[PDB]
PDB file of C-alpha atoms in Angstrom:
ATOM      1  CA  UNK A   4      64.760  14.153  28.592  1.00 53.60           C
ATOM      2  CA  UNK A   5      65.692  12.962  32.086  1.00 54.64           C
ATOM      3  CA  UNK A   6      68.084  10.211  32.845  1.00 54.50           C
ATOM      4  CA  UNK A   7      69.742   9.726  36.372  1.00 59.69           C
ATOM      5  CA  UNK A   8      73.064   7.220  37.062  1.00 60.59           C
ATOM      6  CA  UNK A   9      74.628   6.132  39.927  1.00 61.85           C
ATOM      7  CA  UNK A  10      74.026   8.126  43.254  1.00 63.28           C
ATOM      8  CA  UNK A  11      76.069   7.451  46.228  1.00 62.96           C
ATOM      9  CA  UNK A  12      74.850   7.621  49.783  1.00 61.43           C
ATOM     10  CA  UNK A  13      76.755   9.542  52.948  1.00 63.86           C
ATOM     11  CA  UNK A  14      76.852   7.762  56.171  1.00 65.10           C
ATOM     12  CA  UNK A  15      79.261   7.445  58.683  1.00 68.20           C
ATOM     13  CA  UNK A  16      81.636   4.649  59.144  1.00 68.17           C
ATOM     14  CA  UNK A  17      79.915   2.439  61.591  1.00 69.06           C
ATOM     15  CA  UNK A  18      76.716   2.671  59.689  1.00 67.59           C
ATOM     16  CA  UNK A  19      78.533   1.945  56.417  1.00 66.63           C
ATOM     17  CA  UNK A  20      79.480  -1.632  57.444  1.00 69.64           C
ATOM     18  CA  UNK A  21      76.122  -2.192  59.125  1.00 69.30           C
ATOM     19  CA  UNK A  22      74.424  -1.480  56.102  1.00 65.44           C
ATOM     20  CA  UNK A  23      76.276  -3.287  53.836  1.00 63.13           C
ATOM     21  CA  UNK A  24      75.906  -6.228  55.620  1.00 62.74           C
ATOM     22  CA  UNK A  25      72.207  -5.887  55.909  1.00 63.22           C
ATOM     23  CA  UNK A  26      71.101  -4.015  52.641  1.00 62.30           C
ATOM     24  CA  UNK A  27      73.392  -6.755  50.481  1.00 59.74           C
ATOM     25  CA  UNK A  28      76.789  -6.832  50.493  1.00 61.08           C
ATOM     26  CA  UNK A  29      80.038  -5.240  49.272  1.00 60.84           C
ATOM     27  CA  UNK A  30      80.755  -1.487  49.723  1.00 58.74           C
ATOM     28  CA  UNK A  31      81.879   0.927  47.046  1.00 62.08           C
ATOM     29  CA  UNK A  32      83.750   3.722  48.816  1.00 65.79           C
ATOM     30  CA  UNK A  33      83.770   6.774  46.703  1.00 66.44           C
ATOM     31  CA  UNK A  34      86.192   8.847  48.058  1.00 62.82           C
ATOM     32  CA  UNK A  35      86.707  12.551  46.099  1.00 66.54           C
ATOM     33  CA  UNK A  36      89.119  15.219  46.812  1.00 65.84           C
ATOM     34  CA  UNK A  37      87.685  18.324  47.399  1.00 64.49           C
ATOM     35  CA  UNK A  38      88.621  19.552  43.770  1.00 62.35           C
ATOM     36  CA  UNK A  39      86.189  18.032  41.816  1.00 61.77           C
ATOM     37  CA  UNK A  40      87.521  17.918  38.358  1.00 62.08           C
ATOM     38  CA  UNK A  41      86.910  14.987  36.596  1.00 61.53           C
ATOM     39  CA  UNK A  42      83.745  13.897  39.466  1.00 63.21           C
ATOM     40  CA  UNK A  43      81.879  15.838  37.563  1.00 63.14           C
ATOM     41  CA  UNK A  44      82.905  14.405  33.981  1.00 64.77           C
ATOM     42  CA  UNK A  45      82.042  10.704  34.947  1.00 65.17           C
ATOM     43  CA  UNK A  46      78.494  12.464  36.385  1.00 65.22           C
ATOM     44  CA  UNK A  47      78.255  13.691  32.840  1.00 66.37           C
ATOM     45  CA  UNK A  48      78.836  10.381  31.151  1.00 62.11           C
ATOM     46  CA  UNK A  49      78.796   7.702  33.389  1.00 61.87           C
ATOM     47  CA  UNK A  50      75.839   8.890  36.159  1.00 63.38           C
ATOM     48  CA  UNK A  51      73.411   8.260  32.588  1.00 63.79           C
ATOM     49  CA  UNK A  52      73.886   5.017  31.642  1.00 64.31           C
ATOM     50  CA  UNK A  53      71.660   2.426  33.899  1.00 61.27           C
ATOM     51  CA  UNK A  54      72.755  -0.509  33.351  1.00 58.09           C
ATOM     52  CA  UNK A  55      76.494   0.782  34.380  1.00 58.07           C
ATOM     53  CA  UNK A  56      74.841   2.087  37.210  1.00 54.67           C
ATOM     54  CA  UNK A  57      72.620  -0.774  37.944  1.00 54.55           C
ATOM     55  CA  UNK A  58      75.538  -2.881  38.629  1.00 52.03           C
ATOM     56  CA  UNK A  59      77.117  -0.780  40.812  1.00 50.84           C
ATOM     57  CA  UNK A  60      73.998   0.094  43.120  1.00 54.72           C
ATOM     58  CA  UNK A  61      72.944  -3.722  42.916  1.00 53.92           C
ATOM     59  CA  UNK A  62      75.769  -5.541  43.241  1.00 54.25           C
ATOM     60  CA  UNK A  63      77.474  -3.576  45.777  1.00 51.74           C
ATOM     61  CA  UNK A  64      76.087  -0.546  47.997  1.00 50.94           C
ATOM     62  CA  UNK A  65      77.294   2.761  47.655  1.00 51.17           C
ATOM     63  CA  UNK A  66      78.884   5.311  50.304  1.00 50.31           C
ATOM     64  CA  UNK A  67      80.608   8.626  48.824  1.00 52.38           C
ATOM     65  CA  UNK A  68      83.378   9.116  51.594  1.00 52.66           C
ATOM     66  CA  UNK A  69      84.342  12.657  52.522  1.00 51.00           C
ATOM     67  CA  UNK A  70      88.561  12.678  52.434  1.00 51.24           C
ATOM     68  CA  UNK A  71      88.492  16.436  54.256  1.00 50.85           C
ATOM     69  CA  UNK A  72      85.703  16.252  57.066  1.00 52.89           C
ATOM     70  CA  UNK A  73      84.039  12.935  58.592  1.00 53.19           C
ATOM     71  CA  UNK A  74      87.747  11.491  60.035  1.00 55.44           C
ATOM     72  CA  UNK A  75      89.008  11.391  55.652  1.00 54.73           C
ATOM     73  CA  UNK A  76      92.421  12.439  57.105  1.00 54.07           C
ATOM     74  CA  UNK A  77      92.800   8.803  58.191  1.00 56.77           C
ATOM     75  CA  UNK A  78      91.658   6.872  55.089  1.00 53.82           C
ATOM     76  CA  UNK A  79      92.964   9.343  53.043  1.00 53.20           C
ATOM     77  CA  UNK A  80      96.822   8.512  55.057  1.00 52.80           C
ATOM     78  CA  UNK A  81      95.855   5.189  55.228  1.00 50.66           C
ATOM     79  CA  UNK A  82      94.556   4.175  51.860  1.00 51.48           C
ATOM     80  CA  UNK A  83      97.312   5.691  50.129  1.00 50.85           C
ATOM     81  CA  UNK A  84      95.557   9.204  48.168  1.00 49.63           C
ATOM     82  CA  UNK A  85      97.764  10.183  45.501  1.00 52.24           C
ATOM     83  CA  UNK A  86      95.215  11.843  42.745  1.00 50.67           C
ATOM     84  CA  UNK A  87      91.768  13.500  43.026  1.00 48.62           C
ATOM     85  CA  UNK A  88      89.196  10.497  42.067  1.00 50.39           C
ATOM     86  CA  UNK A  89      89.918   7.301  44.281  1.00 50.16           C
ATOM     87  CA  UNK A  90      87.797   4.057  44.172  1.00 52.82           C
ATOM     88  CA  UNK A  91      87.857   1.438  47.511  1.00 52.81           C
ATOM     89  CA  UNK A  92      86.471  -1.995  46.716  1.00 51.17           C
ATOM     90  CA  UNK A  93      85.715  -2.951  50.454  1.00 53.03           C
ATOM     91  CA  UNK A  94      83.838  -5.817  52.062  1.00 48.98           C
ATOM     92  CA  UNK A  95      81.114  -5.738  54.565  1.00 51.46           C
ATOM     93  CA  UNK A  96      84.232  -7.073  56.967  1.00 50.93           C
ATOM     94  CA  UNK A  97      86.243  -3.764  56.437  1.00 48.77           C
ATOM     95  CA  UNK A  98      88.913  -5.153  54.401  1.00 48.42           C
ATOM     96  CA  UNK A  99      89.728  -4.126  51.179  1.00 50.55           C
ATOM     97  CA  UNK A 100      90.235  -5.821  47.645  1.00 49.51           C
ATOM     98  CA  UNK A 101      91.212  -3.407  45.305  1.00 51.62           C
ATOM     99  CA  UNK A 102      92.146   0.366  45.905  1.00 47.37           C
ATOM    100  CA  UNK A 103      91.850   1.705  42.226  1.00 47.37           C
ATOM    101  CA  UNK A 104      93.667   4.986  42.171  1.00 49.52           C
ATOM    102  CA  UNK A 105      92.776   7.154  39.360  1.00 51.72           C
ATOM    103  CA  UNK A 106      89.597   7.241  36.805  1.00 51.79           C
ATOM    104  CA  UNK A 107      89.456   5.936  33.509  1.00 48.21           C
ATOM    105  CA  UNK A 108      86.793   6.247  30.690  1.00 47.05           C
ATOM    106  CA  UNK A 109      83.153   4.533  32.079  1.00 46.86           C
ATOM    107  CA  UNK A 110      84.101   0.960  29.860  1.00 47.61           C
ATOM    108  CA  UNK A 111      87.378   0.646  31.417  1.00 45.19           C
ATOM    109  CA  UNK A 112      86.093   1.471  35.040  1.00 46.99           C
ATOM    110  CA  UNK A 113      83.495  -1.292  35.011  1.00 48.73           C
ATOM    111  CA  UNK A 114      86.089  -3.417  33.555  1.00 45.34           C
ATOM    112  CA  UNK A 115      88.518  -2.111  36.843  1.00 40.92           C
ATOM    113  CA  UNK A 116      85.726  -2.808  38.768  1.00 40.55           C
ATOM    114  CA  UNK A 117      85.625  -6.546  37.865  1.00 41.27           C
ATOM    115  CA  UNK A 118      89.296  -7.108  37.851  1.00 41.60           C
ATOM    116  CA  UNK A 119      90.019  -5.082  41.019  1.00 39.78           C
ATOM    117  CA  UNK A 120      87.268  -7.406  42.661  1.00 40.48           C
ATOM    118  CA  UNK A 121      87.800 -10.932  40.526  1.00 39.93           C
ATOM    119  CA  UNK A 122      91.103 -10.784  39.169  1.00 36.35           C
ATOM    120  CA  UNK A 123      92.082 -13.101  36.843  1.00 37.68           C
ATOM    121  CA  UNK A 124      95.371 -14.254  35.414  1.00 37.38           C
TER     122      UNK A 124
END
């Protein structure tokens, strides 16, 4: 058996915007620390489910952001780091809706996803 997930692409700032903006919209800044840890648990679980991973790639496009080469030092300072796994919700403009700090099981993410992006009250 052979079943893929989500797969994040690695460009450099400038491009990121530019391709968001032209692929679709949206871009979903994975940014790791260079400990791993749980990155590899939500490959496990999470990078196997398509439909999970369908929304992501489709509705937004994907960038896994370095944090210790590729200028990290700045978004990792900037964006507030404070754990290994951290999630930025960022428009094609460069402004951010939701920095999720932290992973939580693959129901709950999607579900962080939505509220970080459309929160409701």
């Amino acid at each position: 058996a052979q079943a893929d997930g989500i797969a994040f692409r690695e460009l450099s700032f400038p491009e990121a915007l530019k391709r968001a903006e032209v692929e679709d919209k949206l871009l979903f800044v994975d940014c790791f620390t260079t400990w791993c840890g749980p990155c590899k648990r939500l490959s496990k679980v999470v990078f196997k489910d398509s439909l999970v991973a369908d929304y992501f790639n489709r509705h937004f496009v994907n960038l896994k952001m370095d944090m210790e080469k590729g200028e990290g030092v700045e978004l990792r300072k900037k964006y507030g780091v404070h754990a290994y796994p951290t999630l930025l919700f960022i428009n094609s403009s460069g402004e951010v809706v939701y920095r999720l700090v932290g992973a939580e099981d693959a129901p709950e993410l999607l579900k962080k996803v939505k509220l970080g992006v459309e929160s409701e009250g």
